[PDB]
Amino acid sequence: RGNNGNMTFNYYANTYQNSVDFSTSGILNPLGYLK
Amino acid sequence: RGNNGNMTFNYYANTYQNSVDFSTSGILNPLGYLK
Amino acid sequence: RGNNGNMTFNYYANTYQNSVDFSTSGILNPLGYLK
Amino acid sequence: STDNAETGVIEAGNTDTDFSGELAAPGSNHTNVKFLFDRSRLLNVIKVLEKDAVFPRPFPTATGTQQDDGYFCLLTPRPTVASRPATRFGLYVSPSDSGVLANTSLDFNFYSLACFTYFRSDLEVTVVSLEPDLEFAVGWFPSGSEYQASSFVYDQLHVPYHFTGRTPRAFASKGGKVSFVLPWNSVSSVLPVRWGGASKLSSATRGLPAHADWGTIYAFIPRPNEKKSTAVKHVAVYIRYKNARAWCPSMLPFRSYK
Amino acid sequence: STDNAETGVIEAGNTDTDFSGELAAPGSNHTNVKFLFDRSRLLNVIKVLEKDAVFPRPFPTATGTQQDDGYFCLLTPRPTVASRPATRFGLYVSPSDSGVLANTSLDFNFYSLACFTYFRSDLEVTVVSLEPDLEFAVGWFPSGSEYQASSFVYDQLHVPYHFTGRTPRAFASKGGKVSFVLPWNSVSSVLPVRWGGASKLSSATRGLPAHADWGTIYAFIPRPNEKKSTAVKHVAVYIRYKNARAWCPSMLPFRSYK
Amino acid sequence: PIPTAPRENSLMFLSTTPDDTVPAYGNVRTPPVNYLPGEITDLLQLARIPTLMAFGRAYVPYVAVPTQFDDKPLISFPITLSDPVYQNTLVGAISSNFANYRGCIQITLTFCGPMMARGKFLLSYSPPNGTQPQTLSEAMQCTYSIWDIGLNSSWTFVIPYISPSDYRETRAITNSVYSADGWFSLHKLTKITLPPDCPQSPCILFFASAGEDYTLRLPVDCNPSYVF
Amino acid sequence: PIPTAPRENSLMFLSTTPDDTVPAYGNVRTPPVNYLPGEITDLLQLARIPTLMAFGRAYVPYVAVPTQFDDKPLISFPITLSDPVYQNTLVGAISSNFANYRGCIQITLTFCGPMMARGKFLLSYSPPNGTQPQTLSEAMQCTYSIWDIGLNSSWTFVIPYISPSDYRETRAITNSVYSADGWFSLHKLTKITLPPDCPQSPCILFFASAGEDYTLRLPVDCNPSYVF
Amino acid sequence: DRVTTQTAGNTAINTQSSLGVLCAYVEDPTKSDPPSSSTDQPTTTFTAIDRWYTGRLNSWTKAVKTFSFQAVPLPGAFLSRQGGLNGGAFTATLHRHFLMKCGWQVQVQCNLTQFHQGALLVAMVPETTLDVKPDGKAKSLQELNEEQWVEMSDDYRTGKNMPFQSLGTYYRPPNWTWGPNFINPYQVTVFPHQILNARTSTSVDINVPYIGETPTQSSETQNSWTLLVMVLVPLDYKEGATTDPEITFSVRPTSPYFNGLRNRYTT
């Protein structure tokens, strides 16, 4: 969620506030996999 | 809770408002215990 | 309750707004009782 | 321990791997990409429009062309010059000479932790004034648009065409500020911090992305052209990268040894 | 009753212990540590920056070094001098002499009820102006940081580097105030009111804690360096110890008998 | 739009509002303080610790006991927590920073003389009267407690709380019955019988703790006269 | 009308508030980025990648090994993440943009000499002392690890986290025990035995990754000295 | 009853007029947790540093006024060898570790007769710089011998003579009036204290845990606890009695957790 301390209430919806992607159809993994 | 009269509603969460301690793993007691 | 038209919601508590008394332990009566 | 760094994968170990120790508790996650870039920073100190301006003509520009330089803020962390995206960043060392001193801008706080190649985020623009008690107004036009540059006469007052429009013209109050989050509007899927391709086919500059931006904001005093003053007023542009996502790890700039 | 005060534990008794009386009802709990320190008080009257300042050089300082004194507020109840933590507190009795009169500060309301040794609390800073209708801005940098002291040129205006940053630069409105609670950020677990150790190993001063602070706030007019005025403007710093916790009971200052 | 009407105290900075404020540098994990012992939950844990009083004779914590027997109190002081025998006690130096109190001042003695010394002391608290009692017969009529010297060497004289109000003032600016609660007075009842080759004029050492029901109220501004 | 009282920080632009703002051009479907691989979830995924350190001899990533054996460290540098052997490592160039850290700096070596070369190297981390150790017997007493040359050609010397605090500073402005955590020192234990017709003075190549528990905190302002 | 023998390691001490072990701030200050600011394995206690370290303290005359005190820094007395207090296996381990963390259990003996009067105030004062001269350096053995007792002047009551960093010739040097490492001599009994009266006891028994700003402080610089022997009632005796009774003190470090092994401390 990032640097967002507003856990309670979002006035504007998720499409207006953020910008979602249109569809086509703790644990940090490494960036290089030896195979 | 101290000098806090806001019994009802906390807008910011407990981590943002206060500063908790990370874990490692009426009745007033005396400060000197005779043993 | 007196001259208080706020029937709904008290933000500050009863101890902060008013001043209660610490404990020790329509109908208008007359001020003089003939006995 | 006994390892091989020629292989390209070196497993990060604790003190207990080679010695007799233990682990340490992971305290904070301030290295999170969505957390690290979610904070405001100075982008460009741009000047405020007082008349129906002209968008700067594309490069190279010969002399005599009456344009308006340093009035437009191309919202991009990449090096810009004269409100157009560039590749090399230049600053002036002996600036008190002839010619037109071009407005160059760069996001200084970005490239010190732009250890990646690609980047996508919803920009949050804040336009803070640098003038005591100024009422201004912030225009915008997206990635792939152009500035409508004329003036239509309203009651014998030359009102410019950048008052109206379908793009957000946010009006500041007298002594107030402007703050509105802009979505990712570019035709590219991500913003290349480093780019090696060419947008055009002939006479293209290698490494210059055409539409890696969030558009261009500008500031304009909301009075008509007859009320044009003389003293130039500035305004500052603060940006914030909401919901940042960064792909493809890359280099950090070369810290000098002098 | 018949007791022994040499033992070190003297049990507090009521009137009914020795005489024929009773108890009294415990009325109020205003001696609670979290309640007693949760109130604002004057800390330091600091001057407002008008240019890209220089953080004061560490002690001892020879003459000729052009620094800026009394512009920084080291947020600590301990005695400070020239915006750096000190041990002895000094005030001026015949101040109208030569030399540079150093800014010294102390929390007067704290030590009268600092009957303890250690202390930890989230500080709540309020920066009240001492100027009629001043628009200022409050910087900060934490316990273990330093002041970025230069100026980057924005549109031929020398904007200093203390506008930008990842630390909170809270902007006051014209006639408004600044108020933001700072967390416990020091590398120490608690703030020693009294300290007897030494932070360094060689040439260390006994009793001077290096990082027993909440950082250092400063005030700066949000105009560039070309708009520097002449008359010096002051600002007042009010602090409040939210969520105070005090360990290890200790002494109170010596009230004189004259 | 929620139509709100702000009050007449809008944008007013009051210093002691019971409320938090906006965080600016949140989400900071402070290091844990589970290792430090002895957390002061309440500052009355320190008023209940007996500290030395101070007596004008270079002010002296003890009381010299002269062998000349004259019918006077040996040492005497009013029970007012702004009196200068109380400036450097944790009872007195905390409660000078407050406005009211309630409860029992607890005066503890310690006879610091030789072991072979005997004798008796009279510890008389007087309520406020028109004139301080001086005769032993005028302090016998008050509330007293005859203290003996022996194997034990302390006596916690709990001064009672006799007040016409629920709280008492702690700063006698204008002297009244709300701030000054009468005098304490230590008479020597029988003279101290020292054996041969023992030091004359022994020393009674005074303490001043607080009772188990000692209560405080209304923090006021302190006195910065120490820093001068 | 909902009667609201705005606070004292009203109309204050703070740069790092944990909060959104009003959208102006909402409902924009961005194109999907499911095709791009390797999303950096956290910037500690890059500090754990070993990068070349830089040594003053035209600064050199490797260490020339002279065949003249004198009892000195072959190369040595303090473990302070503002030291100029750390300006161009992803450990050092990320953590110079922060204020605190926690965890284990991981120094990885690579002997880039010929295959037929043998020999042993001593890799001694010293805690902060009054004087940097120089004798081999003064670095033997510290934390060391004797590294052998053979079929494998790397050694990840995990420098431990020995600190009097939970976090350490990462910018030694005023030098103390909170920013400088003692010296690293590479001694040649036995001299490198080269066979005939093999190049003299081989090259040890140094890396600097981060441990699996390396943690960072408190972003501060960067240094724009690169752009000059 | 009043006869307590305290066997610790191999050095067992005795007293026959004890008042009781003043356990401070906790029930059992022997129990202590390992530090959380170290990742290496701590050197715990062992049977050569779990013992009583008896030293000497300066004598006590009639010329000692009220509140003339004498401070023993801990573990500063092990380094400088104040009063001949040699640690042996503890000093030779504390010089080879960077982080030390222990509670203390002190015991001050001073044998007054039944014909003497006078009372010491033996207290364990946290976090003071009472040994250090106001120039910045600590007192040597001769400077703890030329005076025998530090008189409570105005500079110690107020906090004026505590060490400081000089401002230099650029600043004007202020009139130094206060500093937070004062002594309030009327309020030393807030600390863990026992009065060593002439008519109740000859030995006081104090037991303090580890306190400090960090979960383990440094070894060669810390001044966490400070034994503080203060003269409340001055000594008095008729002529012919035993003059100038000597004062000793016995210090046992309860549960030490050393960290950070390095070579012997050289400046």
Short mmCIF file of C-alpha atoms in Angstrom, two decimals, chain F residues 25 41 58 67 76 83 103 117 128 132 163 182-183 202 206 218:
data_model
loop_
_atom_site.label_atom_id
_atom_site.label_comp_id
_atom_site.label_asym_id
_atom_site.label_seq_id
_atom_site.Cartn_x
_atom_site.Cartn_y
_atom_site.Cartn_z
CA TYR F 25 7.72 11.12 10.66
CA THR F 41 4.61 4.94 37.15
CA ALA F 58 25.88 26.18 56.20
CA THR F 67 22.63 19.70 77.53
CA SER F 76 10.33 23.84 65.52
CA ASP F 83 8.77 26.88 54.38
CA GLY F 103 -2.66 13.64 52.98
CA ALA F 117 22.76 7.14 75.29
CA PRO F 128 -2.91 26.32 63.88
CA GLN F 132 3.03 28.92 68.64
CA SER F 163 -7.97 20.75 57.47
CA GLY F 182 0.19 24.63 62.45
CA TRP F 183 3.59 23.93 63.88
CA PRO F 202 24.36 14.20 70.16
CA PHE F 206 15.31 14.55 60.58
CA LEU F 218 -3.13 21.11 39.83
#
